[PDB]
Amino acid sequence: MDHYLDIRLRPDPEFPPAQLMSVLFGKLHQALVAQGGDRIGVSFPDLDESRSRLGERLRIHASADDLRALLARPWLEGLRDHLQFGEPAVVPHPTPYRQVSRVQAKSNPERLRRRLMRRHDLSEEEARKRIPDTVARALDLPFVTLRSQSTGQHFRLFIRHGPLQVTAEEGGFTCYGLSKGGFVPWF
RNA sequence: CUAAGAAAUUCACGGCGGGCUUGAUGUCCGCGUCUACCUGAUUCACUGCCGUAUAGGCAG
């Protein structure tokens, strides 16, 4: 956790950086699924909260063995033309800590209507009256649009950075690099 | 401080009966429309699960 690897987005004359970010995030998700482990933290060094911008720089946080296992994986092939890869340097000691969390939303009422059909055996009009169409959740959070190998539907994954703390305790990490209770340093 | 200031047009009404517009007609010769383009920007806010929950989380 003491080390970090920094990825900068090369500007692209054919693609805006958002879909490049989505592609690389899917590649690192596949790399972490293949590699395993629960000590991989993500960071957005230039996250703009004014317009919910993802940013043009990426920071991944891991240990030395985890970082060399990640860079040894051949997922990096086919993406070197658009990114920078620095060195697994030690993170600065006086750094505030913040958490990253995947915030999902119930933006589609018909999914929950189908769910309550499978839970309470209600009819179509019962679910229509019980759940209006205005219950959609709109999030002013940065997001990435990806499709999964298990389910081919394209899903949107919101990423939100927590408040700055002064210390961090041990926690877990998901397959996306998002923390289920962990923290990443800010610098 | 205005060619300032003021004001009831209104009651009633049968327009109609009749009619052959028809004869004839050459539109027409000629014609280089070209050249050059990322539709796509996160544009699939989607599928399922824990929960009575629309309250609120979780899975790829």
Curated annotation (Swiss-Prot):
<protein>
    <recommendedName>
        <fullName>CRISPR-associated endonuclease Cas6/Csy4</fullName>
        <ecNumber>3.1.-.-</ecNumber>
    </recommendedName>
</protein>
<dbReference type="Pfam" id="PF09618">
    <property type="entry name" value="Cas_Csy4"/>
</dbReference>
<dbReference type="GO" id="GO:0051607">
    <property type="term" value="P:defense response to virus"/>
</dbReference>
<dbReference type="GO" id="GO:0003723">
    <property type="term" value="F:RNA binding"/>
</dbReference>
<keyword id="KW-0255">Endonuclease</keyword>
<keyword id="KW-0540">Nuclease</keyword>
<dbReference type="InterPro" id="IPR042564">
    <property type="entry name" value="CRISPR-Cas6/Csy4_sf"/>
</dbReference>
<comment type="similarity">
    <text>Belongs to the CRISPR-associated endoribonuclease Cas6 family. Cas6f/Csy4, subtype I-F/Ypest subfamily.</text>
</comment>
<comment type="function">
    <text>CRISPR (clustered regularly interspaced short palindromic repeat) is an adaptive immune system that provides protection against mobile genetic elements (viruses, transposable elements and conjugative plasmids). CRISPR clusters contain sequences complementary to antecedent mobile elements and target invading nucleic acids. CRISPR clusters are transcribed and processed into CRISPR RNA (crRNA). Processes pre-crRNA into individual crRNA units. Absolutely required for crRNA production or stability.</text>
</comment>
<keyword id="KW-0051">Antiviral defense</keyword>
<comment type="subunit">
    <text>Part of the Csy ribonucleoprotein complex with a probable stoichiometry of Csy1(1),Csy2(1),Csy3(6),Cas6/Csy4(1)-crRNA(1). A Csy3(6),Cas6/Csy4(1)-crRNA(1) subcomplex is also formed.</text>
</comment>
<feature type="active site" description="Proton acceptor">
    <location>
        <position position="29"/>
    </location>
</feature>
<dbReference type="GO" id="GO:0004519">
    <property type="term" value="F:endonuclease activity"/>
</dbReference>
<dbReference type="GO" id="GO:0043571">
    <property type="term" value="P:maintenance of CRISPR repeat elements"/>
</dbReference>
<dbReference type="InterPro" id="IPR013396">
    <property type="entry name" value="CRISPR-assoc_prot_Csy4"/>
</dbReference>
<feature type="site" description="Substrate binding">
    <location>
        <position position="148"/>
    </location>
</feature>
<keyword id="KW-0378">Hydrolase</keyword>
<keyword id="KW-0694">RNA-binding</keyword>
